[PDB]
Protein backbone atom coordinates (compact mmCIF):
# COMPACT_ATOMS: atom_id res chain seq x y z
CA UNK A 1 0.00 0.00 0.00
CA UNK A 2 2.92 2.34 0.63
CA UNK A 3 5.70 2.11 -1.71
CA UNK A 4 9.04 3.25 -0.26
CA UNK A 5 11.93 4.38 -2.46
CA UNK A 6 15.51 3.73 -0.82
CA UNK A 7 18.38 5.45 -2.71
CA UNK A 8 21.80 7.29 -1.62
CA UNK A 9 25.43 6.86 -2.61
CA UNK A 10 27.33 3.16 -2.42
CA UNK A 11 27.90 2.00 0.85
CA UNK A 12 25.26 4.70 2.52
CA UNK A 13 24.07 1.70 3.99
CA UNK A 14 20.89 1.22 2.39
CA UNK A 15 20.76 -2.54 2.10
CA UNK A 16 21.89 -2.82 6.37
CA UNK A 17 18.66 -0.44 6.28
CA UNK A 18 16.48 -2.52 4.53
CA UNK A 19 17.22 -5.97 6.63
CA UNK A 20 16.89 -4.02 9.99
CA UNK A 21 13.48 -2.38 9.13
CA UNK A 22 12.52 -6.25 8.02
CA UNK A 23 13.96 -7.63 11.27
CA UNK A 24 16.71 -9.49 9.90
CA UNK A 25 19.77 -10.54 9.75
CA UNK A 26 22.26 -7.40 10.05
CA UNK A 27 25.76 -8.56 10.05
CA UNK A 28 26.41 -9.94 6.62
CA UNK A 29 25.50 -8.10 3.48
CA UNK A 30 26.57 -7.98 0.05
CA UNK A 31 27.05 -4.82 -1.98
CA UNK A 32 23.66 -4.52 -4.52
CA UNK A 33 24.03 -5.27 -7.87
CA UNK A 34 20.78 -4.14 -9.27
CA UNK A 35 17.68 -4.12 -6.53
CA UNK A 36 15.90 -5.65 -3.63
CA UNK A 37 12.19 -5.81 -2.46
CA UNK A 38 10.87 -6.08 1.00
CA UNK A 39 7.57 -5.85 2.56
CA UNK A 40 7.33 -4.48 6.21
CA UNK A 41 4.11 -3.75 8.80
CA UNK A 42 4.46 -0.38 10.73
CA UNK A 43 1.71 0.99 12.39
CA UNK A 44 -1.06 -0.58 10.42
CA UNK A 45 0.80 0.32 7.21
CA UNK A 46 2.36 -2.03 5.12
CA UNK A 47 5.39 -0.57 3.07
CA UNK A 48 6.78 -2.01 0.19
CA UNK A 49 10.50 -0.87 -0.17
CA UNK A 50 12.72 -1.28 -3.27
CA UNK A 51 16.05 -0.73 -2.11
CA UNK A 52 18.28 0.04 -5.42
CA UNK A 53 21.92 0.13 -6.01
CA UNK A 54 23.88 3.13 -5.65
CA UNK A 55 26.89 2.89 -7.47
CA UNK A 56 27.86 5.57 -9.87
CA UNK A 57 27.39 3.63 -13.08
CA UNK A 58 23.95 2.86 -11.93
CA UNK A 59 22.27 5.51 -10.86
CA UNK A 60 20.74 6.22 -14.15
CA UNK A 61 18.70 3.52 -13.32
CA UNK A 62 17.27 5.37 -10.52
CA UNK A 63 14.65 6.43 -12.80
CA UNK A 64 13.34 3.54 -13.64
CA UNK A 65 12.07 3.22 -10.13
CA UNK A 66 10.42 7.03 -9.74
CA UNK A 67 6.52 6.07 -10.99
CA UNK A 68 4.17 5.97 -7.95
CA UNK A 69 6.88 6.32 -5.06
CA UNK A 70 4.93 7.67 -2.30
CA UNK A 71 8.05 8.10 0.20
CA UNK A 72 11.52 8.65 -0.57
CA UNK A 73 14.36 7.45 1.57
CA UNK A 74 17.59 8.49 0.95
CA UNK A 75 20.74 7.45 3.27
CA UNK A 76 23.76 9.14 3.85
CA UNK A 77 27.14 8.07 5.31
CA UNK A 78 27.35 10.23 7.78
CA UNK A 79 30.69 9.27 8.42
CA UNK A 80 31.92 9.68 4.69
CA UNK A 81 32.57 13.29 4.93
CA UNK A 82 34.64 12.63 1.76
CA UNK A 83 31.61 11.69 -0.30
CA UNK A 84 28.99 15.15 0.99
CA UNK A 85 29.30 17.37 -2.01
CA UNK A 86 28.76 14.01 -4.19
CA UNK A 87 25.79 13.05 -2.05
CA UNK A 88 24.37 16.45 -1.83
CA UNK A 89 24.57 16.69 -5.78
CA UNK A 90 22.43 13.22 -6.24
CA UNK A 91 20.32 14.51 -3.57
CA UNK A 92 19.54 17.52 -5.37
CA UNK A 93 18.99 16.55 -8.43
CA UNK A 94 15.99 13.73 -7.51
CA UNK A 95 14.58 16.23 -5.75
CA UNK A 96 14.56 18.31 -9.36
CA UNK A 97 12.66 15.18 -10.36
CA UNK A 98 9.44 15.69 -12.05
CA UNK A 99 8.29 12.06 -11.16
CA UNK A 100 9.14 12.62 -7.58
CA UNK A 101 7.09 16.04 -6.97
CA UNK A 102 5.98 16.50 -3.64
CA UNK A 103 7.47 13.11 -2.18
CA UNK A 104 7.77 13.26 1.27
CA UNK A 105 11.88 12.96 1.76
CA UNK A 106 13.02 10.91 5.05
CA UNK A 107 17.14 12.15 4.69
CA UNK A 108 18.70 9.17 6.99
CA UNK A 109 22.18 10.19 8.72
CA UNK A 110 23.43 6.85 8.94
CA UNK A 111 26.12 4.92 10.75
CA UNK A 112 26.02 7.51 13.68
CA UNK A 113 28.06 4.58 15.69
CA UNK A 114 30.91 5.43 13.49
CA UNK A 115 33.76 8.14 14.89
CA UNK A 116 34.21 10.46 12.35
CA UNK A 117 30.13 10.51 11.98
CA UNK A 118 28.72 14.62 11.23
CA UNK A 119 25.89 15.06 13.43
CA UNK A 120 22.18 15.30 11.68
CA UNK A 121 22.62 19.16 11.85
CA UNK A 122 25.86 19.74 10.39
CA UNK A 123 24.72 17.12 7.30
CA UNK A 124 21.33 19.28 7.15
CA UNK A 125 23.34 22.99 7.04
CA UNK A 126 26.07 21.62 4.46
CA UNK A 127 23.41 20.20 2.27
CA UNK A 128 20.77 23.37 2.55
CA UNK A 129 18.41 21.15 3.43
CA UNK A 130 16.09 24.16 4.63
CA UNK A 131 16.06 25.24 1.04
CA UNK A 132 13.70 22.46 0.32
CA UNK A 133 10.44 24.37 -0.24
CA UNK A 134 8.64 21.83 -2.68
CA UNK A 135 7.48 19.05 -0.36
CA UNK A 136 8.15 17.63 3.01
CA UNK A 137 11.09 16.61 4.56
CA UNK A 138 13.05 15.32 7.88
CA UNK A 139 16.44 14.47 8.33
CA UNK A 140 17.16 11.52 11.42
CA UNK A 141 19.89 10.39 12.66
CA UNK A 142 20.53 6.39 12.77
CA UNK A 143 22.67 3.37 12.99
CA UNK A 144 21.26 0.59 10.43
CA UNK A 145 23.73 -1.63 12.55
CA UNK A 146 22.20 -1.12 15.70
CA UNK A 147 18.95 -0.18 14.84
CA UNK A 148 19.04 3.12 17.10
CA UNK A 149 16.97 6.09 15.13
CA UNK A 150 15.72 3.67 12.60
CA UNK A 151 11.99 3.35 14.07
CA UNK A 152 12.07 7.30 15.10
CA UNK A 153 12.66 7.86 11.00
CA UNK A 154 10.25 5.39 10.30
CA UNK A 155 7.66 7.00 12.88
CA UNK A 156 8.07 10.63 10.77
CA UNK A 157 6.84 8.20 7.46
CA UNK A 158 4.22 6.80 8.73
CA UNK A 159 3.02 10.39 9.66
CA UNK A 160 3.25 11.54 6.40
CA UNK A 161 1.53 8.89 4.32
CA UNK B 1 39.91 12.22 17.82
CA UNK B 2 41.43 11.43 14.85
CA UNK B 3 44.83 9.75 15.20
CA UNK B 4 42.12 7.35 13.90
CA UNK B 5 43.71 8.42 10.35
CA UNK B 6 46.82 8.64 8.43
CA UNK B 7 46.80 11.73 6.40
CA UNK B 8 49.24 13.53 3.57
CA UNK B 9 52.35 11.08 4.58
CA UNK B 10 55.20 10.88 1.84
CA UNK B 11 57.81 8.26 1.63
CA UNK B 12 57.03 6.72 5.64
CA UNK B 13 56.44 3.91 7.21
CA UNK B 14 53.87 3.70 9.39
CA UNK B 15 51.14 1.37 11.62
CA UNK B 16 49.29 0.83 14.78
CA UNK B 17 49.88 -1.92 17.33
CA UNK B 18 46.94 -4.30 18.56
CA UNK B 19 44.54 -2.76 20.97
CA UNK B 20 45.14 1.33 19.45
CA UNK B 21 42.15 1.09 16.98
CA UNK B 22 39.92 -1.22 18.70
CA UNK B 23 37.24 -1.26 16.39
CA UNK B 24 37.00 2.13 15.61
CA UNK B 25 36.82 3.99 11.77
CA UNK B 26 40.13 4.24 9.97
CA UNK B 27 40.72 6.79 7.54
CA UNK B 28 43.94 6.70 4.88
CA UNK B 29 43.96 9.61 2.61
CA UNK B 30 46.60 11.63 -0.03
CA UNK B 31 49.53 9.18 1.16
CA UNK B 32 52.80 8.54 -1.65
CA UNK B 33 55.27 6.14 -1.50
CA UNK B 34 53.92 5.03 1.92
CA UNK B 35 53.99 1.80 4.32
CA UNK B 36 50.73 1.57 6.45
CA UNK B 37 50.42 -1.33 8.63
CA UNK B 38 47.17 -1.61 10.80
CA UNK B 39 47.31 -4.60 12.84
CA UNK B 40 44.14 -3.85 14.69
CA UNK B 41 40.65 -4.46 13.69
CA UNK B 42 38.36 -1.60 12.81
CA UNK B 43 34.97 -0.57 11.64
CA UNK B 44 35.14 0.65 8.36
CA UNK B 45 38.41 1.66 6.49
CA UNK B 46 38.29 4.42 3.29
CA UNK B 47 41.64 4.72 1.40
CA UNK B 48 41.47 8.05 -0.75
CA UNK B 49 44.13 9.08 -3.20
CA UNK B 50 46.80 7.04 -1.99
CA UNK B 51 50.05 6.23 -4.51
CA UNK B 52 52.50 3.74 -4.28
CA UNK B 53 51.45 2.25 -0.84
CA UNK B 54 51.87 -1.02 1.21
CA UNK B 55 48.70 -1.54 3.03
CA UNK B 56 47.97 -4.04 5.82
CA UNK B 57 44.51 -3.30 6.99
CA UNK B 58 43.44 -6.08 10.51
CA UNK B 59 39.77 -7.67 10.24
CA UNK B 60 37.59 -4.72 9.13
CA UNK B 61 33.71 -4.95 10.17
CA UNK B 62 31.94 -3.32 7.53
CA UNK B 63 33.18 -1.83 4.06
CA UNK B 64 37.13 -1.75 2.64
CA UNK B 65 36.44 1.38 0.01
CA UNK B 66 39.63 2.22 -2.22
CA UNK B 67 38.78 5.41 -4.06
CA UNK B 68 41.17 6.77 -6.67
CA UNK B 69 44.17 4.75 -5.51
CA UNK B 70 46.99 3.78 -7.87
CA UNK B 71 49.73 1.49 -7.77
CA UNK B 72 49.21 -0.17 -4.25
CA UNK B 73 49.51 -3.53 -2.93
CA UNK B 74 47.83 -4.51 0.30
CA UNK B 75 46.49 -7.59 2.30
CA UNK B 76 43.33 -7.51 4.45
CA UNK B 77 39.92 -9.06 5.37
CA UNK B 78 36.45 -7.23 5.44
CA UNK B 79 32.76 -7.95 5.57
CA UNK B 80 32.81 -5.64 1.67
CA UNK B 81 35.73 -4.79 -0.46
CA UNK B 82 35.04 -1.90 -2.59
CA UNK B 83 37.15 0.03 -5.47
CA UNK B 84 36.11 2.74 -7.61
CA UNK B 85 38.64 4.82 -10.39
CA UNK B 86 41.59 2.90 -9.40
CA UNK B 87 44.49 1.35 -11.37
CA UNK B 88 47.11 -1.58 -10.60
CA UNK B 89 45.79 -2.14 -7.11
CA UNK B 90 46.97 -5.86 -6.06
CA UNK B 91 45.02 -7.25 -2.84
CA UNK B 92 45.49 -10.63 -0.86
CA UNK B 93 42.19 -10.67 0.01
CA UNK B 94 39.44 -11.82 2.59
CA UNK B 95 36.10 -10.60 2.16
CA UNK B 96 32.51 -12.28 3.05
CA UNK B 97 30.73 -10.74 0.43
CA UNK B 98 31.03 -10.66 -3.07
CA UNK B 99 34.23 -7.57 -3.89
CA UNK B 100 33.30 -5.35 -6.47
CA UNK B 101 34.95 -2.93 -8.82
CA UNK B 102 33.89 0.10 -10.60
CA UNK B 103 35.97 2.48 -13.43
CA UNK B 104 38.87 0.72 -12.56
CA UNK B 105 41.68 -1.27 -14.65
CA UNK B 106 44.37 -3.78 -13.73
CA UNK B 107 42.99 -4.88 -9.96
CA UNK B 108 44.84 -8.50 -9.34
CA UNK B 109 42.86 -10.43 -6.34
CA UNK B 110 44.73 -13.16 -4.09
CA UNK B 111 44.00 -14.96 -1.24
CA UNK B 112 44.54 -13.45 2.17
CA UNK B 113 47.63 -14.90 3.88
CA UNK B 114 48.44 -13.45 7.23
CA UNK B 115 49.48 -14.67 10.83
CA UNK B 116 49.90 -12.84 14.19
CA UNK B 117 49.13 -13.93 17.99
CA UNK B 118 47.11 -10.95 17.97
CA UNK B 119 44.66 -11.55 14.97
CA UNK B 120 42.59 -14.49 15.31
CA UNK B 121 40.54 -12.75 18.27
CA UNK B 122 40.85 -9.36 15.87
CA UNK B 123 39.08 -11.52 13.19
CA UNK B 124 36.10 -12.45 16.42
CA UNK B 125 35.61 -8.98 17.41
CA UNK B 126 35.24 -8.12 13.93
CA UNK B 127 32.60 -10.34 13.47
CA UNK B 128 34.27 -11.62 10.79
CA UNK B 129 34.26 -15.86 10.18
CA UNK B 130 37.91 -17.16 8.61
CA UNK B 131 35.41 -19.66 6.77
CA UNK B 132 33.80 -16.72 4.82
CA UNK B 133 36.01 -15.80 2.20
CA UNK B 134 34.82 -15.24 -1.24
CA UNK B 135 38.06 -13.42 -2.47
CA UNK B 136 37.86 -14.58 -5.99
CA UNK B 137 34.70 -14.02 -7.38
CA UNK B 138 34.67 -9.90 -8.32
CA UNK B 139 31.94 -8.17 -10.02
CA UNK B 140 32.91 -5.09 -12.48
CA UNK B 141 29.92 -2.95 -12.38
CA UNK B 142 31.84 -0.91 -15.91
CA UNK B 143 33.35 -4.46 -17.93
CA UNK B 144 34.68 -4.20 -20.97
CA UNK B 145 33.72 -5.92 -24.12
CA UNK B 146 36.21 -8.46 -24.98
CA UNK B 147 38.59 -7.45 -21.82
CA UNK B 148 38.81 -7.85 -18.25
CA UNK B 149 39.36 -4.97 -15.78
CA UNK B 150 40.94 -7.57 -12.87
CA UNK B 151 42.23 -11.05 -12.56
CA UNK B 152 43.92 -13.10 -10.21
CA UNK B 153 47.31 -12.70 -8.71
CA UNK B 154 49.98 -15.81 -10.10
CA UNK B 155 49.04 -18.91 -7.66
CA UNK B 156 53.26 -18.99 -7.06
CA UNK B 157 53.53 -15.08 -5.85
CA UNK B 158 55.23 -14.42 -2.52
CA UNK B 159 52.93 -12.41 -0.29
CA UNK B 160 56.45 -10.91 0.97
CA UNK B 161 57.35 -9.36 -2.71
CA UNK B 162 53.96 -7.65 -2.12
CA UNK B 163 53.32 -6.80 1.38
CA UNK B 164 56.66 -7.24 3.43
CA UNK B 165 56.46 -7.53 6.91
CA UNK B 166 57.62 -4.51 9.12
CA UNK B 167 61.26 -3.86 10.11
CA UNK B 168 60.49 -0.65 12.27
CA UNK B 169 61.00 -0.69 15.98
CA UNK B 170 57.74 0.82 16.73
CA UNK B 171 56.15 -2.20 14.57
CA UNK B 172 58.59 -4.74 15.91
CA UNK B 173 56.40 -6.16 18.81
CA UNK B 174 53.47 -7.30 16.47
CA UNK B 175 55.46 -11.05 15.60
CA UNK B 176 54.11 -11.70 11.79
CA UNK B 177 54.34 -14.79 9.96
CA UNK B 178 53.17 -14.58 5.96
CA UNK B 179 53.83 -18.42 5.96
CA UNK B 180 50.26 -20.10 3.96
CA UNK B 181 50.28 -22.81 6.92
CA UNK B 182 50.60 -20.13 9.70
CA UNK B 183 47.72 -17.78 7.86
CA UNK B 184 44.64 -17.19 10.09
CA UNK B 185 42.45 -17.50 6.73
CA UNK B 186 43.19 -20.96 5.46
CA UNK B 187 44.26 -20.62 1.32
CA UNK B 188 41.49 -20.86 -0.87
CA UNK B 189 41.72 -21.41 -4.45
CA UNK B 190 38.05 -20.35 -5.16
CA UNK B 191 37.69 -19.37 -8.86
CA UNK B 192 41.28 -21.07 -10.01
CA UNK B 193 41.37 -23.07 -13.01
CA UNK B 194 40.96 -26.69 -11.82
CA UNK B 195 42.72 -29.89 -13.25
CA UNK B 196 40.64 -32.32 -12.17
CA UNK B 197 36.25 -32.57 -11.47
CA UNK B 198 36.62 -34.43 -8.13
CA UNK B 199 35.31 -32.67 -5.48
CA UNK B 200 34.44 -33.29 -2.07
CA UNK B 201 32.20 -31.75 0.65
CA UNK B 202 33.61 -32.11 4.57
CA UNK B 203 30.74 -30.69 6.93
CA UNK B 204 32.57 -30.48 10.84
CA UNK B 205 29.80 -29.34 13.56
CA UNK B 206 30.41 -26.61 15.81
CA UNK B 207 32.61 -27.22 19.04
CA UNK B 208 35.73 -26.55 21.05
CA UNK B 209 38.10 -28.73 18.63
CA UNK B 210 36.24 -27.99 15.01
CA UNK B 211 38.40 -25.15 13.73
CA UNK B 212 41.61 -26.88 14.99
CA UNK B 213 40.36 -30.43 13.33
CA UNK B 214 38.99 -27.83 10.09
CA UNK B 215 42.67 -26.83 10.08
CA UNK B 216 44.10 -30.22 10.62
CA UNK B 217 42.12 -31.94 7.82
CA UNK B 218 43.04 -29.11 5.54
CA UNK B 219 47.14 -29.69 6.16
CA UNK B 220 47.02 -33.52 5.76
CA UNK B 221 44.70 -33.05 2.13
CA UNK B 222 47.08 -29.98 1.16
CA UNK B 223 50.21 -32.78 2.51
CA UNK B 224 48.57 -35.33 -0.18
CA UNK B 225 48.52 -32.74 -3.17
CA UNK B 226 44.99 -32.00 -2.98
CA UNK B 227 43.67 -28.83 -2.94
CA UNK B 228 41.33 -26.49 -0.91
CA UNK B 229 38.92 -24.83 -2.69
CA UNK B 230 36.31 -23.39 -0.98
CA UNK B 231 34.86 -22.69 2.77
CA UNK B 232 31.89 -21.95 4.64
CA UNK B 233 30.67 -21.06 8.23
CA UNK B 234 26.69 -20.99 8.29
CA UNK B 235 23.58 -22.41 10.39
CA UNK B 236 22.01 -25.60 9.47
CA UNK B 237 18.85 -26.19 10.38
CA UNK B 238 17.11 -29.46 10.25
CA UNK B 239 15.73 -29.24 6.63
CA UNK B 240 19.50 -27.86 5.13
CA UNK B 241 20.80 -31.00 6.80
CA UNK B 242 18.01 -33.27 4.90
CA UNK B 243 18.81 -31.58 2.00
CA UNK B 244 22.71 -31.69 1.81
CA UNK B 245 23.09 -35.09 3.86
CA UNK B 246 20.17 -37.17 2.44
CA UNK B 247 20.11 -40.23 4.48
CA UNK B 248 22.81 -39.64 6.13
CA UNK B 249 21.06 -36.64 8.53
CA UNK B 250 19.60 -38.57 10.97
CA UNK B 251 23.11 -38.99 12.60
CA UNK B 252 24.07 -35.31 12.20
CA UNK B 253 20.75 -33.74 13.35
CA UNK B 254 21.50 -33.59 17.33
CA UNK B 255 24.37 -31.30 16.47
CA UNK B 256 22.55 -28.36 14.31
CA UNK B 257 21.78 -26.34 17.56
CA UNK B 258 25.56 -26.44 18.38
CA UNK B 259 26.08 -23.55 16.12
CA UNK B 260 27.47 -22.79 12.87
CA UNK B 261 29.15 -25.79 10.85
CA UNK B 262 32.09 -25.74 8.77
CA UNK B 263 32.17 -26.70 5.72
CA UNK B 264 35.50 -27.68 3.02
CA UNK B 265 35.39 -27.93 -0.43
CA UNK B 266 38.41 -30.57 -1.58
CA UNK B 267 39.41 -30.65 -5.20
CA UNK B 268 41.56 -33.08 -6.92
CA UNK B 269 42.18 -36.87 -8.42
CA UNK B 270 41.34 -38.96 -5.66
CA UNK B 271 39.85 -36.19 -3.29
CA UNK B 272 36.86 -38.18 -1.89
CA UNK B 273 38.75 -41.56 -1.11
CA UNK B 274 41.80 -39.55 0.44
CA UNK B 275 39.66 -37.40 2.72
CA UNK B 276 37.74 -40.67 3.75
CA UNK B 277 40.71 -42.02 4.83
CA UNK B 278 42.29 -39.19 6.58
CA UNK B 279 39.37 -38.59 8.95
CA UNK B 280 38.93 -42.32 8.98
CA UNK B 281 42.02 -42.38 11.21
CA UNK B 282 41.95 -38.96 12.47
CA UNK B 283 38.65 -38.22 13.38
CA UNK B 284 37.65 -41.84 14.96
CA UNK B 285 34.78 -40.68 17.79
CA UNK B 286 33.86 -37.24 16.27
CA UNK B 287 31.32 -37.13 13.61
CA UNK B 288 31.62 -35.26 10.59
CA UNK B 289 30.06 -35.56 7.12
CA UNK B 290 32.22 -36.62 3.85
CA UNK B 291 30.94 -37.01 0.65
CA UNK B 292 30.89 -41.03 -0.06
CA UNK B 293 31.83 -40.67 -3.51
CA UNK B 294 32.83 -38.65 -6.59
CA UNK B 295 29.80 -39.46 -7.95
CA UNK B 296 27.84 -37.63 -5.42
CA UNK B 297 30.26 -34.89 -4.06
CA UNK B 298 29.45 -32.49 -6.62
CA UNK B 299 25.92 -32.48 -5.84
CA UNK B 300 26.70 -33.04 -2.27
CA UNK B 301 28.81 -29.44 -2.53
CA UNK B 302 26.31 -27.59 -4.87
CA UNK B 303 23.53 -28.88 -2.32
CA UNK B 304 25.09 -26.72 0.23
CA UNK B 305 26.32 -23.58 -1.77
CA UNK B 306 22.65 -24.02 -2.49
CA UNK B 307 20.82 -23.50 1.30
CA UNK B 308 23.92 -21.16 2.36
CA UNK B 309 23.54 -19.11 -0.27
CA UNK B 310 19.95 -18.47 0.58
CA UNK B 311 20.34 -18.34 3.93
CA UNK B 312 23.32 -15.89 4.07
CA UNK B 313 21.34 -13.98 1.02
CA UNK B 314 19.24 -10.58 1.23
N1 LIG C 1 29.26 1.05 11.54
C1 LIG C 1 28.17 1.02 10.74
N2 LIG C 1 28.24 0.37 9.55
C2 LIG C 1 27.17 0.32 8.72
C3 LIG C 1 25.92 0.98 9.11
N3 LIG C 1 25.04 0.76 8.10
C4 LIG C 1 25.68 0.04 7.14
N4 LIG C 1 26.95 -0.22 7.52
C5 LIG C 1 28.00 -0.96 6.78
O1 LIG C 1 28.36 -0.21 5.62
C6 LIG C 1 28.63 -1.11 4.53
C7 LIG C 1 27.73 -0.78 3.35
O2 LIG C 1 26.39 -1.08 3.69
P1 LIG C 1 25.32 -1.49 2.57
O3 LIG C 1 24.01 -1.79 3.27
O4 LIG C 1 25.78 -2.63 1.69
O5 LIG C 1 25.25 -0.14 1.70
P2 LIG C 1 24.34 0.13 0.40
O6 LIG C 1 25.20 0.04 -0.83
O7 LIG C 1 23.83 1.55 0.55
O8 LIG C 1 23.21 -0.84 0.29
C8 LIG C 1 28.40 -2.51 5.06
O9 LIG C 1 29.69 -3.04 5.38
C9 LIG C 1 27.55 -2.33 6.31
O10 LIG C 1 27.82 -3.33 7.30
C10 LIG C 1 25.92 1.66 10.43
O11 LIG C 1 24.92 2.26 10.88
N5 LIG C 1 27.05 1.64 11.15
F1 LIG D 1 26.12 -2.01 -2.24
AL1 LIG D 1 25.17 -0.56 -2.64
F2 LIG D 1 24.26 0.93 -3.04
F3 LIG D 1 26.71 0.26 -2.97
F4 LIG D 1 23.66 -1.45 -2.35
MG1 LIG E 1 22.70 -2.31 -1.06
Redesign the pocket.
Given at each position: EVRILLL??????????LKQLASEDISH????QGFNIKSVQSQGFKLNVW?I??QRKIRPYWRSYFENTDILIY?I?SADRKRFEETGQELTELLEEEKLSCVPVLIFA?????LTAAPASEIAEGLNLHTIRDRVWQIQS?????GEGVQDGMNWVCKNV | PKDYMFSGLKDETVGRLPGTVAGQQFLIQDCENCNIYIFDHS??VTIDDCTNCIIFLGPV???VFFRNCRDCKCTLAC??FRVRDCRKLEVFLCCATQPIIESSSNIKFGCFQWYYPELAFQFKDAGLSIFNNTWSNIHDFTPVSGELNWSLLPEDAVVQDYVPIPTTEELKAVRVSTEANRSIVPISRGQRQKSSDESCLVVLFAGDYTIANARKLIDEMVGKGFFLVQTKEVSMKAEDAQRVFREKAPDFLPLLNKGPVIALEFNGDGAVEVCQLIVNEIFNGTKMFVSESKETASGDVDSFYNFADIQMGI
Open positions: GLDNAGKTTLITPTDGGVDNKQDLCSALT | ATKGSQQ
